[PDB]
Amino acid sequence: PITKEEKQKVIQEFARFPGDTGSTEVQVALLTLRINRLSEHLKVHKKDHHSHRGLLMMVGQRRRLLRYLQREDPERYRALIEKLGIRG
Amino acid sequence: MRRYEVNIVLNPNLDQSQLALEKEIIQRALENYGARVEKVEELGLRRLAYPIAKDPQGYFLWYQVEMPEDRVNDLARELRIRDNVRRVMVVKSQEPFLANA
Amino acid sequence: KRQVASGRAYIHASYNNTIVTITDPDGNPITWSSGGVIGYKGSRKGTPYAAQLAALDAAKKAMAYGMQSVDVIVRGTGAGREQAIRALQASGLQVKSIVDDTPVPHNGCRPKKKFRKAS
Amino acid sequence: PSRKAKVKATLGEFDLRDYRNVEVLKRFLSETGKILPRRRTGLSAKEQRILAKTIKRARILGLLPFTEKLVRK
RNA sequence: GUGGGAGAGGGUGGUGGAAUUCCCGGAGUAGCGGUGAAAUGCGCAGAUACCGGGAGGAACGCCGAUGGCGAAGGCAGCCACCUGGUCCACCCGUGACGCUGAGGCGCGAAAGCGUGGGGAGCAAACCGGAUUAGAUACCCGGGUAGUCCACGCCCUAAACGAUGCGCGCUAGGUCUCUGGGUCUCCUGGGGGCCGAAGCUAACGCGUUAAGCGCGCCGCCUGGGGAGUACGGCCGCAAGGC
Ligand SMILES: [K+]
Ligand SMILES: [K+]
Ligand SMILES: [K+]
Ligand SMILES: [K+]
Ligand SMILES: [Mg+2]
Ligand SMILES: [Mg+2]
Ligand SMILES: [Mg+2]
Ligand SMILES: [Mg+2]
Ligand SMILES: [Mg+2]
Ligand SMILES: [Mg+2]
Ligand SMILES: [Mg+2]
Ligand SMILES: [Mg+2]
Ligand SMILES: [Mg+2]
Ligand SMILES: [Mg+2]
Ligand SMILES: [Mg+2]
Ligand SMILES: [Mg+2]
Ligand SMILES: [Mg+2]
Ligand SMILES: [Mg+2]
Ligand SMILES: [Mg+2]
Ligand SMILES: [Mg+2]
Ligand SMILES: [Mg+2]
Ligand SMILES: [Mg+2]
Ligand SMILES: [Mg+2]
Ligand SMILES: [Mg+2]
Ligand SMILES: [Mg+2]
Ligand SMILES: [Mg+2]
Ligand SMILES: [Mg+2]
Ligand SMILES: [Mg+2]
Ligand SMILES: [Mg+2]
Ligand SMILES: [Mg+2]
Ligand SMILES: [Mg+2]
Ligand SMILES: [Mg+2]
Ligand SMILES: [Mg+2]
Ligand SMILES: [Mg+2]
Ligand SMILES: [Mg+2]
Ligand SMILES: [Mg+2]
Ligand SMILES: [Mg+2]
Ligand SMILES: [Mg+2]
Ligand SMILES: [Mg+2]
Ligand SMILES: [Mg+2]
Ligand SMILES: [Mg+2]
Ligand SMILES: [Mg+2]
Ligand SMILES: [Mg+2]
Ligand SMILES: [Mg+2]
Ligand SMILES: [Mg+2]
Ligand SMILES: [Mg+2]
Ligand SMILES: [Mg+2]
Ligand SMILES: [Mg+2]
Ligand SMILES: [Mg+2]
Ligand SMILES: [Mg+2]
Ligand SMILES: [Mg+2]
User: Which residues span the domain enclosing D16?
Assistant: First the structure.
């Protein structure tokens, strides 16, 4: 699964400031972690479609948040994509 | 690293040497998979509700342990190789749910 | 000629026939009877009176082996089960215990079209 | 209407998740090895739901029966 | 986000008992089976019924419900692992990041197709027995594809609440699942019943709207011809849109 220590590690690693737990960067980082874990779960167990739908929904949510960041502050958008290595 | 409980029902007709050998193999297999034991309750021979392996009784052993999850199944298989061992059930530990309290 | 003197009595009752098998305490049969052992040939075997005749016939055959007490075991729902019960109960054979042990599955096999709308 | 007695009311403090306690789970079975309904046990939905799986565990371990035979018919 | 919660939600591996069939042995004898009544069938190469042992396939009795979960199809032994959704409490973080959604993409009961395997029970076609005026049926004895598994296709349905999704507003009572709380009760989410206003052609709906409103998509324009023809796209085919 995704234990609390890993979640706090990534939250503190992507927090805009001490105490931030819900900024766009933190949400995108957490969604990316969950997406990578689910993709590793879906390489094996490729017959699991109900979880594949959740993967699709997480990808859509991350895309919408990244689009919002693109609209508002493209600098933090580029920095987030550089740190996480997304968009190929 | 999760906490589990292991129920092992084996042949009640074993003598003390054969029972010691079976428990030795059980302990060695627990060490081979990194299963830290917290307590043990040896109930021993008890009357079954239905014949298991053509025997109306069975020798019961119970181990509360803590081990990595990824190999739990892989451990249970190792405990089913012995012919004297006839029942192996591993259950994730749960807090007691009391009723009529 | 074994002189068992005590055994079991299995009653297999269906909507088409009732058949009684008298066995030893280990289950090995000694004598038996049914609706066909009596003169009844067709549907008259699925009759409580035919079941009574079959039970009494098997009991009298068990008298030849000198049996006194029996343990009755009932399997299957069929017209004539209780009549065979009452036939064995007062037949000279002492009935020690009546037990219904009808084999009911845990939904394993698919029934015929006759028994469908269930599982 | 099952006005004889409730299994819960005829009992004290016990763990519903203990699959090894046989003498207490025997009371929750019928004359056959079947699990008693809600009207007989007097448990709640959650209580009965936990009791079912614990009874199944006790059956698999060989402590409780899967099915018994009816007597005195 | 933090902390809790319920669940047949999904995938993989393992595992349990009842029963059916088959095989082996014991014991045992003249029929069993089946129907409105019968016959085919099976049985002296010993059946049925009974006991014990073994094999195999498939489905999970009680729990179990008017219950739960899921977007739908749909999901029911048990254990473990992997995994999706969801609810509540705290009022903590971001600061309109929202709703819908033509196309596109993916999932999609059963039946059906391909390759390989499996095959106990059931069972289209088919072989028979009856019934009947006839019986290409209903009833009875058999029985292949199939049902099962892996992988790949197929895209249908009374795929039904015959009710698209989201948000707000508008009496309550009662039953229930699941949380939280000052736990007679209140509050939140979900499943039912009865009903205010109101709506409806009526039946009925009525805080789970079919009421009052707003946003967006889909669809209808008399019946037969006809979901047919042609064209296109898709499919190995059946055929689908
Ligand atoms: K339901
Ligand atoms: K074939
Ligand atoms: K339609
Ligand atoms: K409460
Ligand atoms: Mg073994
Ligand atoms: Mg008959
Ligand atoms: Mg599930
Ligand atoms: Mg034989
Ligand atoms: Mg036959
Ligand atoms: Mg035959
Ligand atoms: Mg013949
Ligand atoms: Mg002969
Ligand atoms: Mg047979
Ligand atoms: Mg047998
Ligand atoms: Mg075979
Ligand atoms: Mg039920
Ligand atoms: Mg639901
Ligand atoms: Mg449905
Ligand atoms: Mg605030
Ligand atoms: Mg602010
Ligand atoms: Mg949407
Ligand atoms: Mg679309
Ligand atoms: Mg389909
Ligand atoms: Mg299919
Ligand atoms: Mg096929
Ligand atoms: Mg094939
Ligand atoms: Mg058949
Ligand atoms: Mg015919
Ligand atoms: Mg006619
Ligand atoms: Mg004729
Ligand atoms: Mg047929
Ligand atoms: Mg065959
Ligand atoms: Mg074919
Ligand atoms: Mg419907
Ligand atoms: Mg609809
Ligand atoms: Mg219409
Ligand atoms: Mg609606
Ligand atoms: Mg409600
Ligand atoms: Mg109403
Ligand atoms: Mg009115
Ligand atoms: Mg009216
Ligand atoms: Mg509404
Ligand atoms: Mg028209
Ligand atoms: Mg016209
Ligand atoms: Mg038309
Ligand atoms: Mg059509
Ligand atoms: Mg065309
Ligand atoms: Mg073509
Ligand atoms: Mg055709
Ligand atoms: Mg055709
Ligand atoms: Mg067509």
Answer: 1-73
Exposure b/e, C36-49, CB count within 10 A at least 16 = b: ebbebeeeebbbbe
C-beta atoms of D69 and C100 within 8 A: yes
Measured in angstroms, the resolution is 3.3
Q: Which of residues 51-90 of B touch strand E (CB under 7 A)?
A: 51-52, 54, 69-70, 72-73, 76-77, 80, 87, 89-90
The total number of structural domains in chain B stands at 1
3-class DSSP assignment, residue D62: coil
Domains in chain C, number: 1
Query: Containing domain of residue C45, as a range?
Result: 1-119
What does the longest C-alpha to C-alpha distance in chain A come to? 42
Q: Cα separation of D14 and D8, whole Å?
A: 10
> Which ligand is nearest to the Cα of residue C112, counting in written order?
27
Is the distance from CB of B63 to CB of B30 less than 8 angstroms?
Answer: yes
Q: For position C32, which CATH number holds?
A: 3.30.420.80
Residue C108 CA to E20 C1' — how many Å? Answer: 8
Whether the CB-CB separation of C60 and C87 falls below 8 Å is answered with: no
Euclidean distance between CA atoms A46 and A54, whole angstroms: 14
Q: Which domain holds residue B48?
A: 1-101
